[PDB]
Amino acid sequence: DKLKIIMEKGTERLKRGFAKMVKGGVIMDVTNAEQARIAEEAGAVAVMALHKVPADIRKAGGVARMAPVEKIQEIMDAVTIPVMAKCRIGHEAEARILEALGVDMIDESEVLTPADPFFHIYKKKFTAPFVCGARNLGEAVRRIWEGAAMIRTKGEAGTGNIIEAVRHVRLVNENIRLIQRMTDEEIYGVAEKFAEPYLRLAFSVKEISGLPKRVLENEPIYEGFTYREIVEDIYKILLEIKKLGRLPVVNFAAGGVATPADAALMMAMGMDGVFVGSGIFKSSNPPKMARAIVEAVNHWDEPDVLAEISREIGEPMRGQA
Amino acid sequence: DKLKIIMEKGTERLKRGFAKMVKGGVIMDVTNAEQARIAEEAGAVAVMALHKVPADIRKAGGVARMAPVEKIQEIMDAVTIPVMAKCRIGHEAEARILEALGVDMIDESEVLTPADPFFHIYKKKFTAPFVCGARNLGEAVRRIWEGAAMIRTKGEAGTGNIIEAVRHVRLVNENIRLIQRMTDEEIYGVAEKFAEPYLRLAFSVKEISGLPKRVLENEPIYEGFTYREIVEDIYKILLEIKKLGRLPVVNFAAGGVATPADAALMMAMGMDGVFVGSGIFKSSNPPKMARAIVEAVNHWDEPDVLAEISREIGE
Amino acid sequence: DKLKIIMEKGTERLKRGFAKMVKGGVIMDVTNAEQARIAEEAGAVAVMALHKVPADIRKAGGVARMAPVEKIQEIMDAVTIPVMAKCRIGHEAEARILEALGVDMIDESEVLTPADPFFHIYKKKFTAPFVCGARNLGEAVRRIWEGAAMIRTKGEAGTGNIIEAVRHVRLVNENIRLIQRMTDEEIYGVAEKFAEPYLRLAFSVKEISGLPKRVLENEPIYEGFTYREIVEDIYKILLEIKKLGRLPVVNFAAGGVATPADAALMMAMGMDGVFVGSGIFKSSNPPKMARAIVEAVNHWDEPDVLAEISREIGEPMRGQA
Amino acid sequence: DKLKIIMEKGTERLKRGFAKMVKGGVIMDVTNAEQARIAEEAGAVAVMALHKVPADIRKAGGVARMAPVEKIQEIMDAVTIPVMAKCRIGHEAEARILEALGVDMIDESEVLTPADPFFHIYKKKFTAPFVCGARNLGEAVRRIWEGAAMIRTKGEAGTGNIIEAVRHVRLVNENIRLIQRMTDEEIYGVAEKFAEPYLRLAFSVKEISGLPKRVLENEPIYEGFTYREIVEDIYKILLEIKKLGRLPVVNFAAGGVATPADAALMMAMGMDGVFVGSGIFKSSNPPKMARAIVEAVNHWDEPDVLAEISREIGEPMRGQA
Amino acid sequence: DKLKIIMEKGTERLKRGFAKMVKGGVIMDVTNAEQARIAEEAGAVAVMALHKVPADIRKAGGVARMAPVEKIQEIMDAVTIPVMAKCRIGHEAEARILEALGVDMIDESEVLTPADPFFHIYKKKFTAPFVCGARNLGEAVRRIWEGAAMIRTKGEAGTGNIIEAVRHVRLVNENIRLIQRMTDEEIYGVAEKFAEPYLRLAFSVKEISGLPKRVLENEPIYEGFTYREIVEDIYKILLEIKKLGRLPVVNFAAGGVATPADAALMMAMGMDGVFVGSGIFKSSNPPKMARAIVEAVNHWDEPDVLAEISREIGEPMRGQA
Amino acid sequence: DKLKIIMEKGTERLKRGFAKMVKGGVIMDVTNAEQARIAEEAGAVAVMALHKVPADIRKAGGVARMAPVEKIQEIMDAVTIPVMAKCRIGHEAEARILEALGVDMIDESEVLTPADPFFHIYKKKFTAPFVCGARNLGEAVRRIWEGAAMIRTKGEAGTGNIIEAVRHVRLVNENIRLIQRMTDEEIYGVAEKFAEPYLRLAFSVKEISGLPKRVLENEPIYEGFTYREIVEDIYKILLEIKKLGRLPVVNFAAGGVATPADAALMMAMGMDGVFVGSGIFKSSNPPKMARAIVEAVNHWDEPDVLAEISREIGEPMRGQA
């Protein structure tokens, strides 16, 4: 047909466009409307609604799910900047609920307890735009194909340690520079590999059925798509990245960003922005810490200014090695 | 002979028919007459009777058996809706007891402590209908062949984690779509695969006897059936499945269904209904939360409603 | 020889004969006279005398021996029904002390700390009848050849988990059906297999002496017999088993029976009778719980009766899963 | 020298002559003058002097040595029956001290902490006779060759469990019947196997020196004896055991004897007598346990007496593993 | 153009120059202003600034970051000797701040939680001089190609154990002695080796991309250079070393220096000076222990003085095993 | 050329002669003056100055270094017999302080925390005499070549277990006998082996450099010596050992001497004397136990006397097994 192409396109651009306006900023994690207020007052271009911090209980033996709906409502009310909420990997009901509730963006989040061990949410079917984590280029591209409108690093949550975030950024960038040194048929090789994870359910079922674990040409693997059809779509996304030299979506740093210096570092690595959660609340005057983070991002190239922002800002959390 | 077939078909259908009546509802685990009352008031379509929670017994590393008879009877005497009860895998006698006690459906359950390491109950012999667990299409078909009237997922009991139920639904569902893309010959092979588990006893014995672990053509392996005979029957079941594009019996989610959200998710994956556990009765307001689950199962296709259902304060 | 073949044929018919005298009922484990009294009031066709619970000594990290003669006395001087006692495996002196002490039958039991790493008591040289455990046909045939008058399943002692009992019955029963389907050439092979455990001591010695671990034609191995001579006898015990489709001796179920449903189950699997142990101690109501077991064995094919019998009882031993 | 062989042989006969004096009775471990008298009054043939019970030293992380001289002396001055004492394996100075103190026999004991990783004491040099433990014929023979006047099972010290003693008796006996079905040529091979452990120090030093671990035909390996020379002596001892059908020296069970039935059992296995240690003074009523065991050894082939002997003797030791 | 080229190849020579100032002296880790003084008065040629000890932070599993700008400031305000601060490996931003804050030298220290898992800071782009730790020659040459002005041993911090410093020193020196023995072609191959670590990211990314891990002649690996480009630069540095028989920059000992004797030992091994951190900390009489270590370095080839130097010094600082 | 090596043979022999002085004696580890005084009173021919009895700093997970100079001076002034002191292995600085301090002997000791991971102190350059431990002939001969004046067995420190001392005495002894049975050429091959450990640092550096681990005939490996030069010197000491029938230096026993009999054992093995430390002071009654060890070394061959000496001597340290 001639539509559904200029329609699906227009719908994709719309979503990606939303994410654009949070560029150059800091998205802060808040647990109560009190916090949501400090955050807006500090310069957060957005907030991330939480009840308990997913990083401990579950990670003191629990299951971390969607935040309670009323607790989210309360946060959307208290502030005028956009508000986000997390859902569990693959949990379509949670996501829809978060979307009927009218959140601005949904985080399909590895920090919550995953709910489908095979498949992420097919985000292209939603109206709310999604942000998703990636540890490397393959992850970023899979999430994007699925419909992700924004990408952040997975990093290392709850630890306040920047290392993992840096690894992910580098893994993604080096994989882009590699794609650019590549021929079109080489790039299609990468697309095949990047599409292997979608096979996981088909292969398990083959083994349960006593058949050999190999790809079959016409067999739907995910949401009606054949393996080849996924490769092809990923390929196109890979050429688009070859041309742009970065992800075709807004791309943030997340996980372990604990100080103005940490924040400046990701910007220096070419990130569009920064998520921070634990880092801030804690310390003896966090409103200043929150503000520091905000300022480090605006002035990430000016050392003399970062040194000023840093002067007396509180006490950054005890992390985890 | 030919009247035998007609019988097997009619009894099957009578049993499967009972399960259809709970289709589309929430079955709740209860530990007393008070709780079974809360459930019936909330809209549960049936309740599962227990005394102590098996998940609890086995975290403390106990043996988990069928609940005490007098206790099952207290729950039956509290409610008008169907009452279910659990027995240990292979525990023929626990199951004959529950049937004679007059429970509506028996759950041959893997959270109780298995009683048979080789074989499940031959459900076909019972007049009471059974529900069994399945982790994959292979288990489900084995249970159906043994005479299960109803299948649920095994999931992960007592965690609140939905992940393991989702895995099993995805494992069964994909396996069915696979079946539908197959020739009748190729399916016979899957059948050959799904009957393999019935050989564990014969093979153990052959090892104990210094013999090699091989199938024999006329060696009766289970309840009089030889391996080839079970493969034949299973094959027929696989063929019925190909036509239907789903299991031929009511099929429910169970194991970790802890939120209206979770309940909706399973219904969106084609499950006929949801089992929920004692979890509901810990927490501020057990009725209401029970009503939230029941309503989630009634409105799983409309997020606006689920969102209001979720929004309950608790006070 | 002439009068020789008749001697033990008639000697064994005579011992096995005693067993036939309890087939069809329950045998309870009693640690005193007040419990042996309670037990007879429930119908127990016999009792097993205990000082302490082997299971409990074992869980304690200790050595479990035959009971104090005085404790055995206080039991045989409390009831009219037959009395049995456990001896450690291989402990010929413990068994003599029990035979001399009068007791009706000795249980050579693996719940007690084993006293011989290689051989069991050659029971044929005794006057008292013996019951031995078996976990599969090979074990039962071996015990019977040694002269056991009665065979029981080993099950899993002290757990209250009937599953091990079930396993041992199915292993024995299926092994018998396999036998019924074999040619004599073939059963001889099973015989060869079944006699191998007797070679353990000879093989350990060959190893200590710098020699190859192999069988020789005239090496007496146990109580006089060669490997070959054991093969032939066991082989004959096999053929006998083929003709009956069961064991040539009474065959009970022990280990794990914690409820009347459990007892019912074992009868329905073709067990001559049932052993139960101290599950009745902490019952919490022992006189009651003990009657239930007895009725259940009596009306095992009657689900409506089993339902009533199960009506009420204490909390019947938590078990170990 | 012909004459030197006759000192060897004649001195040796005299030593064995002392061991024959304790044949048929019970030797008790004692820790003080009070237990010494209890042991003697109960009917011991000898006592064995130790400080702490070792292995109690070894339950603790401890080093177990020869008992203090004042203690051994307190015991010799408390009884008329022979007093024995332990030294650490290879501890030649300890054994000389014991000899100088007046003990009638020295037990080079595995239950103390060994003081030599390669060699035992060359006991022929001594005037006091030694007793040594053995786990198998290989060991018994080696200890005999080195000059043991007496051999006991090693069993399993301070557990109360008889199984390890029963293991070692059966290993030694079965190995003896093995010799007897063998040719002098075959037996020679077993002697070579039985002398390999004297090579332990030589091979280690080879490896440290960079040379292959091989035997050299005139290399002196222990007390001036060469490997070959030792194989010869061991080989003659084996021929001797072939003819005798037992060890050429007095042979006692030891390790885990905890009850009169244990004692009866060992005698029924053709042992000469019994050491008993923990079994008596770790029980609740030591004086009574002690006489019962003594009477058990004397009437081991009379079950009716063993039964009366076993009536009311107190609670045995726990014990272990 | 040619002026920037010029003044740039000369700022390297310049930074190395700076390090010469601290030669023959002691550098001390300080945590507050008080301590800074004690250490200038004691004779430190320089102090190292922390708020807390990284060791303590990591023995307790937290995240060791840059010190607070306050604490660094106060310290800089308390002394006239050159002041140093540590930053996390790879933390471009933490360094730029320190430089932009006035610090005389930056330590890219492995005792702070690393920030980049692939690459160290490109120190040549910096104005401030950097010190870096080395375990062996390849590591030293790598930190030198990246622009380090001075090198120290990594040793082992927070342990008071000098043996790791000594190993690193020996590994370096022996490697240099080995360079001095090679033809230029062999030194090239070493250089090929010394550059491999730069391929970590490229290799990780190729694996994620599904491609064989191989080197590609024209692909930039680090800060624009290809592998081949790095190999050549590292080869030139080995060549300058083959001629100096030494490292082309100042070279100190660090980690595990705890007593005058240790300080002296490091000077005896050819080092330019010592870092000390924990040593002085918590020492009975801080000033005394401080001067003692300094005097030790000044008079390290004069044992008679060392002796009187240690005479009644308040210490000895316990450290892990 | 060889007008230069005679000053050497001169100072070396002068050194060895000093150890000749403490022969036939007991050296006792002491930790203060009172203890030192006891040691001299009991008849020690020397004390070893210690600040923390063997393995205590080990047992507290610490770093064990040279003792405080002020505590060594205390001891030197409290006795008249030679005072020895310990230094860390390879810690030249610690040694030069000890020499400069006037101590009579330096024990480069494996019970202190080693300071060099590759090399021991090159003792020839010292004027003060050194004692070194050894586990086997190889280790002895290395320590000797490096200039040890006396050797001690290492055994195991602070365990009270004599067994490790015996292992070492016997490994050296047997190795010496094997030498004496060897053709001069064979001996050369042993000297090649004993030289290998000096390749350790070289091979390390090669592996880091990408080079194959090989020996190159001209490379200075340790203190200017090539590998082959080392092999040559050790060959020479071997041949001396072939003539002497023992070590060219005084050779003591150490590690695990806890009782008078232990001490007598080591003398009966050929040892010259005994280091004791823990044995005496980790003992209920030191001074009496002190006199007993001494008396025991003076009468190691008189059993009647060892017995009296052993009377009422107190309880020895418990030990570790």
Concatenating the DSSP letter of every residue in C83-120 gives: EEEEEETT-HHHHHHHHHTT-SEEEEETTSPPS-SS--
CA distance E165 to C62: 53
Binding-site residue numbers of E for D-ribose 5-phosphate are 29, 158, 256, 277-278
Under an 8 Å CB criterion, which residues of D touch F? 57-58, 60-66, 68-70, 73, 90-94, 96-97, 99-101, 113-119, 201-202, 204-206, 208-211, 219-220
Categorise residue F263: left if φ over 0, alpha if ψ from -120 to 50, beta otherwise: alpha
CA distance A48 to A25: 13
What chains are in contact with B, requiring at least 3 Cβ pairs below 8 Å? A, C
* Three-class DSSP category at E26: strand
**Residue B56 · residue B158 · CB < 8 Å:** yes
Q: Kindly identify which residue of chain A lies nearest to residue E206, measuring between CA atoms.
A: A175
Catalytic residue among F2, F9, F86, F243: F86
Q: Distances in Å between the alpha carbon of E241 and those of A88, E180, E181?
A: 57, 8, 12
Q: Tell me the shortest Cα–Cα distance from B109 to chain C, in angstroms.
A: 15
Instruction: Please enumerate in sequence order all residues whose Cβ is within 8 A of that of B99, keeping only pairs 6 or more positions apart, or say none.
Output: B106, B126, B127, B128, C303
CA distance A227 to A238: 16
* Torsion (CA) E235, E236, E237, E240 in degrees, nearest 10: 130
Look at strands B46-49 and A83-88 and give their pairing: unpaired
Chain E residues with CB-CB distance to F206 below 8 A: 178
Residue in A106, A168, A157 with CA at minimum distance from that of residue A132:
A106
Count of structural domains, chain B? 1
Minimal Cβ distance to C96: which of D167, D262, D306: D306
Q: Kindly identify which residue of chain B lies nearest to residue A73, measuring between CA atoms.
A: B311
**Residue B169 · residue B144 · CB < 8 Å:** no
* Torsion (CA) C72, C78, C82, C87 in degrees, nearest 10: -10
Minimal Cβ distance to D303: which of C88, C97, C210: C97
Look at strands B250-253 and B273-276 and give their pairing: parallel
Do B258 and A63 count as a contact with CB atoms less than 8 A apart?
yes
What chains are in contact with C, requiring at least 3 Cβ pairs below 8 Å? B, D
E strands present in chain B: 26-30, 46-49, 83-88, 105-109, 130-134, 150-153, 220-222, 225-226, 250-253, 273-276
Do E93 and A307 count as a contact with CB atoms less than 8 A apart?
no
Instruction: Please enumerate in sequence order all residues whose Cβ is within 8 A of that of C27, keeping only pairs 6 or more positions apart, or say none.
Output: C44, C45, C46, C47, C48, C84, C252, C273, C274, C275, C276
Tokens of E138: 């390849």
Neighbours of C298 (CB within 10 A): 16
CA distance D63 to A277: 58
Q: Kindly identify which residue of chain C lies nearest to residue D136, measuring between CA atoms.
A: C208
* Three-class DSSP category at B161: coil
Q: Kindly identify which residue of chain B lies nearest to residue A116, measuring between CA atoms.
A: B163
CA distance A20 to C174: 71
Catalytic residue among C86, C124, C213, C243: C86
Burial C130-156 (b: 16+ CB within 10 A, else e): bbbbbbbbbbbbbbbbbbbbbbbbbbb
**Residue B208 · residue C138 · CB < 8 Å:** yes
Q: Tell me the shortest Cα–Cα distance from B264 to chain A, in angstroms.
A: 6
User: What's the one-letter identity of residue F48?
Assistant: M
Binding-site residue numbers of D are 29, 158, 170, 256, 277-278
Minimal Cβ distance to A92: which of B138, B159, B268: B268
Instruction: Please enumerate in sequence order all residues whose Cβ is within 8 A of that of A215, keeping only pairs 6 or more positions apart, or say none.
Output: A199, A227
Minimal Cβ distance to F97: which of E163, E170, E307: E307
* CATH number of the CATH domain containing F256: 3.20.20.70
**Residue D245 · residue D180 · CB < 8 Å:** yes
Binding-site residue numbers of D for D-glyceraldehyde 3-phosphate are 170
CA distance C79 to C101: 16
Q: Radius of gyration over alpha carbons of chain D, in Å?
A: 20
CA distance D140 to D152: 8
Which DSSP letter does residue D82 get?
A: -
**D104: Cα within 13 Å, side-chain hemisphere:** 22
User: What's the one-letter identity of residue B52?
Assistant: K
Minimal Cβ distance to F62: which of E167, E262, E321: E321
Minimal Cβ distance to B101: which of C177, C264, C307: C307
Q: Which of A66, A209, A215, A226 to mutate to test the interface with B (most CBs of B within 10 A)?
A: A209
User: What's the one-letter identity of residue D310?
Assistant: S
Q: Tell me the shortest Cα–Cα distance from A93 to chain E, in angstroms.
A: 32
Tokens of E77: 């305000």
Q: Kindly identify which residue of chain B lies nearest to residue C268, measuring between CA atoms.
A: B93
User: What's the one-letter identity of residue D82?
Assistant: P
Q: Tell me the shortest Cα–Cα distance from F154 to chain D, in angstroms.
A: 15
Burial class (CB in 10 A: 0-12, 13-18, 19+), A218: exposed
Helices B69-76, B33-42: inter-axial angle, 10-degree rounding: 40
Catalytic residue among D71, D86, D154, D282: D86
Burial class (CB in 10 A: 0-12, 13-18, 19+), E284: exposed
Binding-site residue numbers of B for D-glyceraldehyde 3-phosphate are 170
Instruction: Please enumerate in sequence order all residues whose Cβ is within 8 A of that of C110, keeping only pairs 6 or more positions apart, or say none.
Output: C89, C133, C154
Chains B and A touch (3+ CB pairs under 8 A): yes
Cα B163 from chain centroid?
17
Q: Tell me the shortest Cα–Cα distance from A233 to chain E, in angstroms.
A: 17
Dihedral sign of CA atoms B107, B108, B110, B114 in order: positive
Q: Tell me the shortest Cα–Cα distance from F311 to chain D, in angstroms.
A: 6
Residue in C49, C122, C119 with CA at minimum distance from that of residue C81:
C49
Instruction: Please enumerate in sequence order all residues whose Cβ is within 8 A of that of C96, keeping only pairs 6 or more positions apart, or say none.
Output: C126, D264, D303, D306
Residue in E236, E262, E240 with CA at minimum distance from that of residue E317:
E262
Residue in B136, B146, B141 with CA at minimum distance from that of residue B116:
B146
Tokens of A65: 């799910």
CA distance F105 to F103: 6
Categorise residue E90: left if φ over 0, alpha if ψ from -120 to 50, beta otherwise: left
Dihedral sign of CA atoms B258, B264, B270, B276 in order: positive
CA distance A123 to A18: 15
Do C190 and B201 count as a contact with CB atoms less than 8 A apart?
no
**Residue C88 · residue C107 · CB < 8 Å:** no
- Give catalytic status of residue D86 as yes or no: yes
Q: Which helix (H) or strand (E) holds D18?
A: helix D2-22
How was this structure obtained? X-ray
Q: Kindly identify which residue of chain F lies nearest to residue D101, measuring between CA atoms.
A: F307
End-to-end CA distance of chain E: 56
The whole domain housing A65 covers 1-321
Do C268 and B91 count as a contact with CB atoms less than 8 A apart?
no
Chain D residues with CB-CB distance to C225 below 8 A: none
Which DSSP letter does residue A155 get?
A: -
E strands present in B250-290: 250-253, 273-276
E strands present in chain F: 26-30, 46-49, 83-87, 105-108, 130-134, 150-153, 220-222, 225-226, 250-252, 274-276
Neighbours of F16 (CB within 10 A): 17
CA distance E312 to E107: 33
Do A117 and B300 count as a contact with CB atoms less than 8 A apart?
no
Do F61 and E170 count as a contact with CB atoms less than 8 A apart?
no
Resolution (A): 2.7
Tokens of E2: 């040619």
CA distance B214 to B205: 11
Whether cis (ω within 30° of 0) applies to the bond prior to A61 is no
